[PDB]
């Protein structure tokens, strides 16, 4: 079951009933763990029957937004203000888009639309959606395309020093202000390198469990759990147990840190 | 009288004055904590023969201020710069609200004024009112309307996995860029989901006692206390004794969180 | 009237029924500052119609008692394990001391009792007791005695480099292995040495209020707030407001640490 | 001589000579100590033989600019960037303030500069001068102008619920975007509100010594010290010694804080 | 090999391979230790066959970025935006720079280039550039100047109440908004003066090692070692070891701090 | 060799030589983590020529010492104090036990000796071993025999709700009061019970690396580190790298815990 | 004049007696410095007319006492309490030894007298003495003598690792329980390796400046400092400045650390 973990954790909410105030989410100074029990869900303006929830914002620092986006019956997307690029990935559910032909989007496909390019979203039952929209950085006369797939069907890359497995869902052209990698490990790898660069992170775990440091803390993590890495965050992963660690992530790239 | 624990707090000012230099209010990166002690009164400019509070402002990463008013005898409100929406709760008192046909706003009664809108507040004897005020956010095409009335002559909206009971000042319409909530609790009972939201608040608790969180800290409040909550810190509270416990409450909608 | 306060402090418990959990109390590594909300009163054993709240016991790493008694009326004290000497002193009320003829200690007085030295307290209307008691460290042939005397009754000492006013309750010959000092301050005067020595105290502060330094902590605090310092505690003291500060004071002394 | 210990501290950076490393200031994140031993001296851009520091610039947060100026022989001001409003206090020597007929300006005496008004400050033996620079808040037609005066010749001011004596350096009008004021306070006396206020700080101790409480944090303070207090931090002071307390400060008033 | 341990530091990254997450790096909120088991390069963008990994960012607070850039054979530079001035420094092997003239930079070489300067890095076998570009503060009608030196011919400098060996690499003048200082202390030798300025700055230990004092922080540093100091941060170094300590450093200068 | 990397750590203290007073050593109120970096040797008293260096004794609160023997050419044993029981844990080298036979003790093999249970090591080229003494505590006429083995040769004994392979060195007969557990996990591997419970541990990492949990405390370990885990702190452990992880661990037993 | 600064210390006490509450003295867990502001001078227990201040003693979880005796005109020491050895150093002034042949011991001379040793220190002028004491822990048959030396009379140690410069007041005999170890390093220099012993301490600095670590705490230290170190914590030191670095320092051994 794909994913399935990511959206029935093995510690749910339901399951802290008992413990008032309790909650794993932590929001620091240039990270945060948010969790589950913490998710405020609310109707996302301009779409219709949609539940989202924000879990990151440029109010944290950041240059993007991800929420989740909980799609019920007969439900449509709204259009991101003028100028915000923005990616859709499907974690549960199924949805169908529409601008140069129809599509159906499932659970590991997802889809890129570049600054103001006209598209729908219309889901006919349900569908978790982990959004990120960013102002579009115009580079020159550079302009990105529209971009759908899905996880499977990218190739495996180069990870110098490392051994996790690395997937890239859009180009790495010059055009493109951001990417989204799909990194693996197996039980007992880690991060040989203890990054600490101007990037900036989205990270939602969608399966396994593990250590995850960033600065000086360490947070035990689950399928399910995201996270805000702000620029220069000491970061480190490390998968436990006995399935694999896959996790969905943010980065901004082709541009002049200046 | 009605939120008369507000204005006349258990434990006082001047039950602290032989505690050199101690204060229950906390300033922190994402929250604050005023209490009583701290709260800081100057004549209010443009206004007649009244005290002012700023409780909360912009140099704490918000986007709107907090404060409270304190008119005297014979008193008169001023008027917000150019495109500033304003909205006054009366916890104290009476006031008189003219554009037109006065209008009489006592303990419990409230109105919110579109940005500009001509309006004016003169007091008798004393009154304190609950303030905030905000440069307006012109969504396109919208636009918002004078309103009035008294928080008990608001219909108990539905909260779900939520127990408290929500009531709300103003509309969820698209016009408005924030809302004022009225949520009660009975003692016992406390907030089910650890919010974390990119939503802020700034809140005065007008009845009862009870434990808020906010981030890793724990606070005991009691009315007449006021809470900054700055987007995405995580929050709960849970209402003790014998009342019950209601608070007053800013938060920001109906606008893009990019 | 004298140590009035002491026995009605500015902040009083009732003062905070409005603020669940809350204390200003601490009991750290190397102190405490026991204040009123924290007093647990309960039947002194051996005593008649008088409770009895411990706030200082060797639980903590002292080698001393030290605890008020509450007595009533028609109550009498229950002589003091074997071994042990005892030091009354009286915050409020009066109370009667029997052996060899027998004085009326009234407030301000005091009366230490030998270990094994027979002796009884009877109050017949009301009295506050604020009580030390060790097990005496027998040295050569040297034995105390009886010693019952008024604070006011005592010679003001002179301390070098010091500016607070002494005076010494107990002899300061070499059998008595501890005395109980009375320190004032005027408003504005402080310690000039930052003491760290092996001496332990314990504390009463019967009038004033002031910033009491222990440790790398500072404390607000009014009469009535009662001190635990453990031998080394970095300790400090400063008299504020109107009024002057007067604290009582164990100090352990004419002993070999080793 | 007036503010003697101001420029030449009781603990000198000199007597730390054999302390690598030590200093007793700190830097926070709602406020700041800055002592003697941290004071980084620079040829003064613009100036003629003018050593200058400076201890608070936007770069934390402020609106306004504070430094100390030691001026040599026959050193001269020199002019601020467009529409700066320039305040100068003499703390050590003498300096002629020339634009309407030179005045002499000795300690104790300041000046103020609207905005683009042309002056000089011309010295021939040596000064040192505490200034604040600051972006004048246009509001309106209103303009200020030239104020020139001593602390002494300046008004004892009341303050509701307080008992330092204050003293403001400029006028009260709106025009006016902030002022200087003087604080007095008696060995004992201390601030009864745990003040909380928008309001901004940068001050320095003349005389005296005492406690400062700059939120949960602690600091001794002697005269030469230098405070930056961000908007909203709670702070506390109390006067402490056998001599009184006198510190200068910089507050931004008359401007709506939305 | 001149500065052949800031390129291969005695603690090296692998020496760290059994201690998963393990890192000597901090990123405070107001200052930065980057050491190299941290370092993350990349592709640099414009440049030919040369990897990048930025160390600061204006993302921090600073104005400015720094990095490290590994030319490898046949590598070129890529000219900075508009307005991004630029300065390198040769750490390891060599390269040429071309227009006015033509130069070949070793270790110890460096040439800061003035805003939209047209120039060329070119490397034939290898070299390593430690790197700073700013958005330029265009004061008036000045401008800088191409500017390419040699540390060893620069002159030592008096510093004033300190006892190291400072050589700045640029000019002074006016037209210069920052500056490269090269500080050298012999063993046992520190900073008289506890450092507290507006100016930040961001240095290379090129040789030696020590303690580094930020704040209230202490950190053991090693040649190869990076650290971010936000403004008014305190710092203070001190050298220890049988060979000296030499660090360049980056100063913003010649500009008001409003 | 066996072991090897538990003799010659990954991280080194030759690698520390440029880090002044850096180390990796941390020893708290409930719990310890010992270094390489940090081993202090000293010529063992009645032993022969070796120096040998104590990670743990009762000063810690312990009830137990663990130490580094490390016998050099010609050296010899001496003997624990009367009713010290003693282990020994070759983990590197040879030496030979003798008095019951006489076997030859290698790498991997061990040795329990009753109280007083007259013994001797003489070791003709070099050891390494890790041991424990321990006052003994009869339960009444039990006792214990002399003990001698290797790991290997040791059952995997079974462990309800874990994965760890698991073999005990001693009897787990009531007679002994201490065994000493050999525990292995492969990577990915951790602990299912957040372990708090009355027994004291002194462990080496003898193979892997992982993350060990100590109250809130994390650290990152390799093979020749030691840990102290003193009653009732919180431990749990993850093994992580392509080999696997494995530890000698203490741990008191068959006794009252009164 | 030699250890001139070791009673008058470069930062004097009253340096800050415009700082109330201010002090350089810590005291914790596992260590403590003290500093001379805090000395707690006051009649020594048995010596006749002598003022002393105990800087450690057993209350702190030591073995021993470590305190400063200030002998003025016609004042002698006082036999310890039975089997109490002691040992002294004279930091200022000249004693007179007497029992053996009278002995005068000036400036840097130290005498260690066997329990029970019946003796008299005697002084006609003045001297600061600084003394350890330890209840002598008996082994065997083995008794010591009376030592009486001078450090420079002392010959440097072997000190394998290290470049400081040993000596020992003491002789090394399995008699003897602890030892008094003289340490030099000149500037620049420090701990190779950061100690973790079983051992305790109780050092002087005698001579010069440093840094110095305990735990994860480090500290700024003069000539006249004083620090305890507790079993097992982690310690390291560094001299810095023009003059080398000396320190006296207590050590216990030939003792099972059972
Ligand atoms: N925290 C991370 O996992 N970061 C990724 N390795 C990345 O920035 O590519
Ligand atoms: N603190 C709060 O009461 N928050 C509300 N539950 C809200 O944001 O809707
Ligand atoms: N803290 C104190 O009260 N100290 C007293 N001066 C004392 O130890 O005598
Ligand atoms: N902290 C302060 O000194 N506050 C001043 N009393 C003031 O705000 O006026
Ligand atoms: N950290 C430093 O070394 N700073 C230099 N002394 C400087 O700012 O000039
Ligand atoms: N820390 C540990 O691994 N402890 C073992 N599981 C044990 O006590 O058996
Ligand atoms: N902290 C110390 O100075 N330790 C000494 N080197 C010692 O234990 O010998
Ligand atoms: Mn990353
Ligand atoms: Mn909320
Ligand atoms: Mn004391
Ligand atoms: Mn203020
Ligand atoms: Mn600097
Ligand atoms: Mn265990
Ligand atoms: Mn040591």
């Keep these: ?4 973990k990511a959206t029935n954790p093995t510690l749910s909410p339901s399951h802290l009933q008992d413990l008032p105030g309790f909650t794993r989410s932590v929001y620091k100074r240039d990270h945060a763990l948010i969790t589950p029990e913490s998710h405020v869900y609310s109707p996302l303006p301009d779409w219709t029957n949609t539940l989202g929830a924000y879990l990151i914002t440029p109010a944290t620092g950041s240059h993007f937004v991800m929420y989740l986006a909980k799609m019920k019956e007969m439900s449509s997307s709204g259009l991101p203000p003028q100028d915000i690029e923005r990616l859709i990935f499907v974690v549960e559910g199924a949805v169908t888009l529409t601008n140069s032909s129809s599509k159906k989007l499932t659970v590991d496909s997802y889809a890129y ?11 006919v039952e349900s569908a978790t959606l982990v959004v990120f929209e960013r102002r579009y950085e115009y580079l020159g ?9 899905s996880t499977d069907k990218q190739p495996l890359l180069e990870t110098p020093g490392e051994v996790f497995e690395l997937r890239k869902l859009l180009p790495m052209s010059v055009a493109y202000d951001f990417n989204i990698h799909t990194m693996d490990f ?9 990054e600490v ?16 440091r960033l600065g000086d803390n360490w947070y035990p993590v689950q399928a399910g759990d995201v996270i805000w890495m702000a620029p ?16 969905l992530l943010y980065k901004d790239v082709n541009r002049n840190p200046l």
Tied chains: 1, 2, 3, 4, 5, 6, 7.
Excluded: M
């Design 141 to 149: 006369s550079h302009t990105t395309e529209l971009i759908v797939g």
């Design 232 to 247: 220069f965050v000491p970061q480190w992963y490390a998968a436990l147990g006995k399935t694999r660690s896959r996790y």
């Design 1 to 4: 079951p794909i994913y399935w």
């Design 197 to 212: 660069h101007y990037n900036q992170h989205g990270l939602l775990l969608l399966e396994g469990q593990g250590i995850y």
């Design 113 to 123: 639309l570049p600054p103001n390019f006209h598209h729908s979203l219309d889901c």
């Design 186 to 194: 197996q039980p007992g790898e880690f991060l040989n390198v203890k």
